Amino acid sequence: GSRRYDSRTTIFSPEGRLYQVEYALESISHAGTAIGIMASDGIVLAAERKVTSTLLEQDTSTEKLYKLNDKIAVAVAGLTADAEILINTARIHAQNYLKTYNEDIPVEILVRRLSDIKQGYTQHGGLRPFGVSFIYAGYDDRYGYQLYTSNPSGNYTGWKAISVGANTSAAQTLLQMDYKDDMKVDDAIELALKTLSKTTDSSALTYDRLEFATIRKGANDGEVYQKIFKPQEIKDILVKTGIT
Amino acid sequence: FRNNYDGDTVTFSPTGRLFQVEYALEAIKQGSVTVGLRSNTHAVLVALKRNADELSSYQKKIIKCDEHMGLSLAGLAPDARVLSNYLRQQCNYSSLVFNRKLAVERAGHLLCDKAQKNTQSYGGRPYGVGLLIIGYDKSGAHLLEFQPSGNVTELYGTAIGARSQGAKTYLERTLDTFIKIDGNPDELIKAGVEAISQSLRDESLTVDNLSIAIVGKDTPFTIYDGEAVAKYI
Amino acid sequence: MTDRYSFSLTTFSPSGKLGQIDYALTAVKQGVTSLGIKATNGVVIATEKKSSSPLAMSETLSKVSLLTPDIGAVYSGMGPDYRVLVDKSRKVAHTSYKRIYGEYPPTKLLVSEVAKIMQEATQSGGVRPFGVSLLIAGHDEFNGFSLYQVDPSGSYFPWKATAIGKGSVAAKTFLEKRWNDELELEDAIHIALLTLKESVEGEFNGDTIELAIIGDENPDLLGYTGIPTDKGPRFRKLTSQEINDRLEAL
Amino acid sequence: GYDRALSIFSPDGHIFQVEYALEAVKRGTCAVGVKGKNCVVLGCERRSTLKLQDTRITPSKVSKIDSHVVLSFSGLNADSRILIEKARVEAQSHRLTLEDPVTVEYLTRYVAGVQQRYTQSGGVRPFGVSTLIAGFDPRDDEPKLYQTEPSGIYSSWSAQTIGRNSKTVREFLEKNYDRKEPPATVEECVKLTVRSLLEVVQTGAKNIEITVVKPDSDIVALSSEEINQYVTQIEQEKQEQ
Amino acid sequence: TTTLAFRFQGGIIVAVDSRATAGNWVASQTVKKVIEINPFLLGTMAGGAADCQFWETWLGSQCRLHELREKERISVAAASKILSNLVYQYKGAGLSMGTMICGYTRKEGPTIYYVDSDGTRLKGDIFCVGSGQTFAYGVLDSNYKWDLSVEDALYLGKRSILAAAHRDAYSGGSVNLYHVTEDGWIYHGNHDVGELFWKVKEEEGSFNNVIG
Amino acid sequence: DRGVSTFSPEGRLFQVEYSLEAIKLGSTAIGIATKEGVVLGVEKRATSPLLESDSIEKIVEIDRHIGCAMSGLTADARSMIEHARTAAVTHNLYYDEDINVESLTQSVCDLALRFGEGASGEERLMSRPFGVALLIAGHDADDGYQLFHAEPSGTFYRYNAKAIGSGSEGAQAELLNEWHSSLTLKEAELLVLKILKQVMEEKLDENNAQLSCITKQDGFKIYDNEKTAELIKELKEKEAAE
Amino acid sequence: MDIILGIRVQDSVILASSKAVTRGISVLKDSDDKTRQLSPHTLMSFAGEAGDTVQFAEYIQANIQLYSIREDYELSPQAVSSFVRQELAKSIRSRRPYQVNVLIGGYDKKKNKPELYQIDYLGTKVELPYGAHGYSGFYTFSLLDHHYRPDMTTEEGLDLLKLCVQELEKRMPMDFKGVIVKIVDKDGIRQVDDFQAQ
Amino acid sequence: GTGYDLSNSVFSPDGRNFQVEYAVKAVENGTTSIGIKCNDGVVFAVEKLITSKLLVPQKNVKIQVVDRHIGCVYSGLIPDGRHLVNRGREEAASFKKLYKTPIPIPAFADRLGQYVQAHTLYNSVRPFGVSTIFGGVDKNGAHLYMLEPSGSYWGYKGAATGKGRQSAKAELEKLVDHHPEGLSAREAVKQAAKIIYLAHEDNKEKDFELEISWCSLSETNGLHKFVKGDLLQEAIDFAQKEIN
Helix, strand or coil, X not given: CCHHHCCCCCCECCCCCEHHHHHHHHHHCCCCCEEEEEECCEEEEEEECXXXXXXXXXXXXXXXXXXXXXCEEEEEEECHHHHHHHXXXXXXXXXXXXXXXXXXXXXXXXXXXXHHHHHHHHHECCCCCCCEEEEEEEEECCCEEEEEEXXXXXXXXXXXXXXXXXXXXXXXXXXXXHCCCCCCHHHHHHHHHHHHHHHCCCCCCCHHHEXXXXXXXXXXXXXXXXXXXXXXXXXXXXXXXCCC | CHHHXXXXXXXXXXXXXXXXXXXXXXXXXXXXXXXXXXXXXXXXXXXXXXXXXXXECECCCEEEEECCEEEEEEECHHHHHHHHHHHHHHXXXXXXXXXXXXXXXXXXXXXXXXXXXXXXXXXXXXXXXXEEEEEEECCEEEEEEECCCCCEEEECEEEECCCHHHHHHHHHHHHHHHCCCCCCHHHHHHHXXXXXXHHCCCCCCCCCCEEEEEEECCEEEEEEECHHHHCCC | CCCCCCCECCCECCCCCEHHHHHHHHHHHHCCCEEEEEECCEEEEEEECCCCCXXXXXXXXXXXXXXXXXXXXXXXXXXXXXXXXXXXXXXXXXXXXXXXXXXXXXXXXXXXXXXXXXXXXXXXXXXXXXXXXXXXXXXXXXXXXXXXXXXXXXXXXXXXXXEECCCXXXXXXXXXXXCCCCCCHXXXXXXXXXXXXXXXXXXXXXCCEEEEEECCCCHHHCCCCCCCCCCCCCEEECCHHHHHHHHCCC | CCCCCCCCCCCCCCCHHXXXXXXXXXXXXXXXXXXXXXXXXXXXXXXXXXXXECCCCCCCCCEEEECCEEEEEEECHHHHHHHHHHHHHHHHHHHHHHCCCCCHHHHHHHHHHHHHHCCCCXXXXXXXXXXXXXXXXXXCCCCEEEEECCCCCEEEECEEEECCCHXXXXXXXXXXXXXXXXXXXXXXXXXXXXXXXXXXXXXXXXXXXXXXXXXXXXXXXXXXXXXXXXXXXXXXXXXXX | CCEEEEEECCEEEEEECCCEXXXXXXXXXXXXXXXXXXXXXXXXXXXXXXXXXXXXXXXXHHHHHHHHHHCCCCCHHHHHHXXXXXXXXXXXXXXXXXXXXXECCCCCCCEEEEEECCCCEXXXXXXXXXXXXXXXXXXXXXXXXXXXXXXXXXXXXXXXXXXXXXXXXXXXXXXXXXXXXXXXXXXXXXXXXXXXXXXXXHHHCCXXXXXX | CCCCCCECXXXXXXXXXXXXXXXXXXXXXXXXXXXXXEEEEEECCCCXXXXXXXXXXXXXXXXXXXXXXXXXXXXXXXXXXXXXXXXXXXXXXXXXXCCCHHHHHHHHHHHHCCCECCCCCCCCCECCCCCEEEEEEEEECCCEEEEEEECXXXXXXXXXXXXXXXXXXXXXXXXXXXXXXXXXXXHHXXXXXHHHHHHXXXXXXXXXXXXXXXXXXXXXXXXXXXXHHHHHHHHHHHXXXX | CCCEEEEECCCEEXXXXXXXXXXXXXXXXXXXXXXXXXXXXXEEEEEECCCHHHHHHHHHHHHHHHHHHHHCCCCCHHHHHHHHHHHHHHHCCCCCCCCEEEEEEEEECCCCEEEEEEECCCCCEEECCEEEECCCXXXXXXXXXXXXXXXXXXXXXXXHHHHHHHHHHHHCCCCCCCEEEEEEECCEEEEECCCCCC | CCCCCCCCCCCCXXXXXXXXXXHHHHHHCCCCEEEEEECCEEEEEEEXXXXXXXXXXXXXXXXEEECCCEEEEEEECHHHHHHHHHHHHHHHHHHHHHHCXXXXXXHHHHHHHHHHHHXXXXXXXXXXXXXXXXXXXXXXXXXXXXXXXXXXEEECCEEEECCCHHHHHXXXXXXXXXXXXXXXXXXXXXXXHHHHHHHHHXXXXXXXXXXXXXXXXXXXXXXXXECCHHHHHHHHXXXXXXXX
């Protein structure tokens, strides 16, 4: 029969842990680092592009920061392809909500739905889990700026500052060291870059190896604006903060 | 060896054996003894009912399938219930659709095929019970032996279960004698009780311990238990 | 019967590796080299027609395929896997796009569809990943020219130029030397030929090399006239003769 | 399609997947519940493996199933969401057909059934979760506290605790809770609850949340201060000796 | 058919006729249009004979299942809703039934629910259902007081069905009475109109038209 | 691995046998049938003094004339009880009469072997056998008071008295000597209480043990604590009497 | 049909619904409340097909309460009406459509403004100062087109309704047995028990 | 490595399907059975071991008919044989229903062939434990066939399988050589009875029962029929006589 070749991706270890989730997490830990920092007037998302080349087209590239909504975006740490499958269903869920209630989807509802999809691959179906961890950056009129994180287990939590992928331990300690409740978007932008700068497994931290995004509520308007920085823009903010 | 080829019914051993089927057959051997024999006018079933405690009952081993057909089981009782139920339905279909009583020979073919399906597919298991089928149809008295392997055979008499070998040799000896017990049921039954007792060893067939069933020319398949079998002990 | 293999065949190992995908990549590594170079007014993709016998007609076997009139694909790895992928790609371009918007899909989206198909062979039950890496070159009005690589995992990335397969490491190094953001299509074709020569052991000519480009529209390849807005496909496979003419200027 | 029997018997008569499911519970943060004479209190501990969270949005441990019943747990967080959603749906369905909200036992019996079912269905692993369900039956003032576990087993308790170090805190409750005189007050009930958690939380004003549930859908969660105040009065009872 | 049920000081009175028809053919004069779901639950029947009988007997089984499951007597509200929701599933299929679910529960007190095949479910103090309903309403409405004595209430209900049996060609046979208190229902006999009419006429001096 | 419906070389189904082992670890349950009714008693066995013992339901009603006691993985018994209640109520709807105790038992046992990963015989969707045994007691016109033992194997035996659970081998021995065709309901009660007391680790009292019976006259009833407390006291006295 | 009316004044939305439930030749009930509270600040009235009416109201109520519990938040009136519209729009193309018309009156605590939504069984939704379903609208729209004012107080709104109910009790063929009036504002939903003579 | 023989559709390093090969063992361990093609028909004979005197003689028939013109006999696991015949019957009924004409022997052979080959394509099924000899008369002659557990089959002049297949084949080869012109149905029946007797030496321990059937354009009108009474005994004797 087939039973012989079944890995049984959804069983408990004698210690009550889920093998595949633990191994998927191990996979994630080797992924480019992604950081999320929430400020009083906005949120910052930054990620390190794992592996690059002279010939890689950075202007047309995007492997870590995706727009899910006009008010929500995510930073990815793990298998890009797996992430894309989840990102697309997340985009659909957001539109179903909008069509049903004629209101943008509250950040947590969307994060919970995505986390639930992941949880499923954990309890039934016999399929491998998604090797992905997300950092959600969004805004809604009930909780304002919010930062969440979800991983292969389907568990999710909220943060003021968080990191996923490689060297999160070092990154977290640095963040927990300089973060301050009354920070400001610009302060956060700088904190994010400094942290990545000290955790990178690379020589220096250049712009061609980064992706940046911010969600601010442009004072001159009154609405929320997402901004996925362009190559040049990253190069700039890189010199200003003193990393050149 | 074996251990590597007895994991499921969909695997042949290097010598062409099906161990799961053979292990199922083992459930029969571990089952209480039952005997069957027929003349030209009747067919009889005699079975030794086994009990758990002296506080428990002696589990029935004879199931009526239709006014003209019935059987005795040895092994997993639930599997007998399933198979006899399928037999009850096939007998029923024959009457309702064709107004025809099902031929014992056909009943045997149907059972063989139903068991065969659980020996070539993954996920299922062979049936773990043996059956002795008796009946009177348009060609007289009949006795069939059903094995979980799907093998069904027509005999003048036979026995299955633990120590069944005793009763079987006895019948193979008494053949020329009982095969002629026509027109006399009591004799055929007695001849059956004598064959069955040839497999005793533990105790002796008592009243609430012996079970007999008969069918024939002008006798609808009926089961006798307890006081009803007293006159045969 | 009935596929009872409803569980994944690719799972995470203690180290976090996805074995089957890793192995699929190793298959791609043994495959014949293929590359793609993007110019300012076009893109060129090429590979070697490694005929498996002189009795075989290498023309009846195309490693470079048209997906849409403005998009082409080439590969490295398991040829059969590629063939079915091309069939599925050509069809998804219709079912998921042309039949909805009445126009062919932009390169990035079709690449996205192909990548999805490949990711599923990485998680669905009862299957193994595709043993190939594709290079997809194309053009679309709002994005211009582009070149993409799609790996067995389903991951894809945009390239200025690159190579996959057998001698990809050396070929990539050679491309990094000759590439610049001002190359004209003919220049890229030339650099493409030079790069491919280092990977070819035996004969190197228009009959052993397969090369196509995505450039200007070919009204002569449209099949009809009378509709101004329809100027023809941008995808064109070079002829054996067209290749040789450029080899003399090698 | 997938229907492999994951929860099956072993030679000793155990079902290891359900057993290992319990191990996932032992690993979860501790949760406790004690019933007063006119209320039931639910306390949970807050991990500290990583601290820099946004408490406003991060999902809380005590969840309202309906306006008169709450559910807390120990184990896999992702799994608990599934059980809570099904409970909430069953609660509304019950109001819809019976025209009366669920009793606490009914709601418990339902959650437990879902857990049991996942222990003998093909293709699924048991829930690595144990719950404490408390509240007041419609129009009733008698407090209710139940506990469910991976196997599908459930029962009511005067007070109970689940999760890591629940062994320790149960001992505390077994020799600090008198059925003769249950915490006759919302205050002394919340105090007995905090005391029990301190036996294992090891000084954690922000590492201990509490929710008080009174009759007629009167449910409220205490703030850091309100709790921190109880801790304070508690550490003095000690020093004053 | 004529059936009624009304609430008053002494609980609930339930009265029904016993005539079954097949058009203008009197199929029977001795049919039971009241079903005893349990010691404290009654159900009345009007409409399709089979539909009423079959589904109300089924309702009984559902109520019994509730008691085994919840270790508690089912409420009148929930019992009436089981039937109401069942019937609603069949809306459009042609089921035909005008029903009343009457009972007592410490939690609800005397309770009456009108439930019909259209899916309508109504709680109320007075209901008359069936082809003869209006005739019953005429007598019942003009003599009803919340403060009727159990004796007087029982009689009004009986007299109302009698009114209906007289004027409605499709109602008749006998009158079956019931009284519901918190100790359950109490059967109050089968009264044949054949004798009940003349008796009531003489003793009451009503039905002054008919010549006797 | 190995199929959930595989035979051992001895002709036994692994999963069913292992199932029986789990039932051995269960709380004790005892049933005694007399021409005056059948008594069913069980060891509550709470696992902590904080657990409200009366919320331990190991004796349940199937119908007014049929009661049930369980032992083993008790959570596994819920669907069985539900199936039984439905079968009993359904039978009454279809036939305007009570379901025979044997018929009810046979129905419950039909669920037993309905397990597997795709057994060719119907649609047995249940990953494993039940891990609980049941004592089904009741009364019907044709065969009077009866007690049945339903196992995960699908076989059900009828007993004059029977014990299941951790102290069964011991308790069964007791029942062997104590039972006789003329026991009164009262004798049966004390007898159940007595034997439970012998096998139980805890000192038997009205809170960690529970009695119940089924009589043709009043049907299945679960004795409230006060009623059993007196029966316990009455037992202690008759024992000390000699 | 039954009378279902709604009027949005300055700081509240008032809903008036007839009390009669008639079948054929008989008025079976005269105290029927054709309303369901969907959330503390959102009320829905309904009229239509005999059984569909309540089944739909209760089904919607069940869903909103579920959302409230799950999100520990109250959906805005606009959000709830959009949800209701979609349900009806699905229904109209189903096997057996819900034949129910509704009025949704809610007080949006975030905007601090009352809102009245009229939605028919086809899923046709519109937001209005005042609305009605059935034949009622034929006498009340022009009446209100004349007497209605934006800045009216809740008390003025009630007098305006009284004017409507009187017109209906004068010209409508059916005896709808008066109406039950409910007010939805910043403090919730309350029923004006005294309209039988206000 | 090893273990290539534990799952049905697996190719061993030498390109074999070991489970099919083990199926063959079950066949060689079975009773002997044969088939003989004559000038206008075919004859089928089989050995029936008399386990004991209890077996009612002549009652446990082994040869099976398909439609009205085809005979089938097999050696190996009897239940598997019946299974294959049931399929053949459904298969023949289907062909007749659509094309009106009863199914041609070649066509029928492939129906059994494809079905049997199908049982060597998946590990969820076991191969057939029988080699089947079958045939009959059709629009253009007589046809004899033998189908192996692998699904392999060919047309035969004579065929045998089971315990004594070698003796039988030896005998069949003689007949083929000494009768290039063709044997007759009458002759074939006797010759078949002889070969079964000769081939019974590889099991001479247990007594047996002879069973013959035939389908001849002239002797049976093209319909499959069993050999009974006088014609049977006459063949039994012809054997008993040449067995000495």
